[PDB]
């Protein structure tokens, strides 16, 4: 008689039956003549795996206390996806907390602009280039060329 079953199946009455696909919950056991019966998850609810659950799960709320907001509302196969506010980024890919974007200080400039999921990279302004302000947007400006200066100040011709 059967011991294990394959993926997306479960053993019941000495026989393999189908698990319910993502998006649906178990409602009635299979028989020897009929396969497992399932029902799509209702509004606000979801199930993201092949499963034998009789109830779906509630969509997570995006915690405002961590500067978090709904980005994509949850489907029946997918949880709520959160993100941060304008001007903040998620600490991780998984977006568990929100942090203000780094400003590149005087003598530095943005090598990379801040995204919504990662942070500003800064570079020290090399020879030939300068910056005099802290900004999460602004890059290193080049020196006025002398066909009519520091990592901070513009040269005077």
């Amino acid at each position, epitope marked *: 008689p059967p011991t294990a079953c394959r993926e997306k199946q479960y053993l019941i009455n000495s026989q393999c039956c189908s698990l319910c696909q993502p998006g649906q919950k178990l409602v009635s056991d299979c028989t020897e*003549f*009929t396969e497992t019966e399932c029902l799509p998850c209702g509004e606000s609810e979801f199930l993201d795996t092949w499963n034998r659950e009789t109830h779906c799960h509630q969509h997570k709320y995006c915690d405002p206390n961590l500067g978090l907001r709904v980005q994509q509302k949850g489907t029946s196969e997918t949880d709520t996806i959160c993100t941060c506010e304008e001007g903040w980024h998620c600490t991780s890919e998984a977006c568990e907390s929100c942090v203000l974007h780094r400003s590149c200080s005087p003598g530095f400039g943005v090598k990379q602009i801040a995204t919504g999921v990662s942070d500003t990279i800064c570079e020290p302004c090399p020879v030939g280039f300068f910056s005099n302000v802290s900004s999460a947007f602004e890059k290193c400006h080049p020196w006025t060329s002398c066909e009519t200066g520091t990592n901070k100040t513009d040269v005077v011709c």
Partner: antibody, heavy 114, light 113 residues
Framework: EVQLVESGGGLVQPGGSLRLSCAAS????????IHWVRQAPGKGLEWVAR????????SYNQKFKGRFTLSVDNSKNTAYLQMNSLRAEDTAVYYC???????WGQGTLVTVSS | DIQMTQSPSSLSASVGDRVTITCRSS???????????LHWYQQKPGKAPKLLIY???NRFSGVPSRFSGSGSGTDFTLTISSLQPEDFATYFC?????????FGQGTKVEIKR
């Protein structure tokens, strides 16, 4: 062998009720689902519902979840389809089938008209 | 709901000729226990459907040998090897792997003479 006799059909008016019966023999009644299927004149079969008499489940087509009710009397190895708020497009031959059994009986014609 | 897509809709063929009908399932009709619950019926006007083939290919007791079912998964064929006059009917397939049970749109076969 396993035998299922449909019974109860006839002429009823729009908004009327009607309970059909499926009297079953030749198998262990409580261990298998009885399904109801119907066939409107000129059209294909349409699955209605099923019930298993271990009192351990009933399944209804979305279309009929309000109005129809399956039901069972173990003492008489019989299953019942109760149809309510009948409409003219419920006019059909109502058949009756045990899971595992792929042949059809004669059914019982239900007509719904003024 | 599993959609069964049956074709052709109508055909006409001479006595003795091979007749082929297709059913397709929108997804696999194979149960996890291995059985594939697809079935073929013949239905004559005013009569109940007569079982021809059960579980894809098993010809039902009493059914003539000219009726035979083949296929697997989502792809099935009913063959009448040698059409006969008495074979005028609407033929149609059935899936019972899942509830709701669903059915092909049928094929009306007619003898040409």
């Amino acid at each position: 062998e396993v035998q299922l006799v449909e019974s109860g059909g006839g002429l009823v008016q729009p908004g009327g009720s009607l309970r059909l019966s499926c009297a079953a023999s030749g198998y262990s009644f409580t261990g298998y689902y009885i399904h109801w299927v119907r066939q409107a004149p000129g059209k294909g079969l349409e699955w209605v519902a099923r019930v298993i008499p271990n009192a351990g489940g009933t399944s209804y087509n979305q279309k009929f979840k309000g109005r129809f009710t399956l039901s069972v009397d173990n003492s008489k190895n019989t299953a019942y389809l109760q149809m309510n708020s009948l409409r003219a497009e419920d006019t059909a031959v109502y058949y009756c089938a045990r899971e595992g059994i792929y042949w059809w009986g004669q059914g019982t014609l239900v007509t719904v008209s003024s | 709901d599993i959609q069964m897509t049956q074709s052709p809709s109508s055909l006409s063929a001479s006595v003795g000729d091979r007749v082929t009908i297709t059913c397709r399932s929108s997804q696999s009709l194979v149960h996890s226990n291995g059985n594939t619950f697809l079935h073929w019926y013949q239905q004559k006007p005013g009569k109940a459907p007569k079982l021809l083939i059960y579980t894809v290919s098993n010809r039902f007791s009493g059914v003539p040998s000219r009726f035979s079912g083949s296929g697997s998964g989502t792809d099935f064929t009913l063959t009448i090897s040698s059409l006969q006059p008495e074979d005028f009917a609407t033929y149609f397939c059935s899936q019972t792997t899942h509830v709701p049970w669903t059915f092909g749109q049928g094929t009306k076969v007619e003898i040409k003479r």
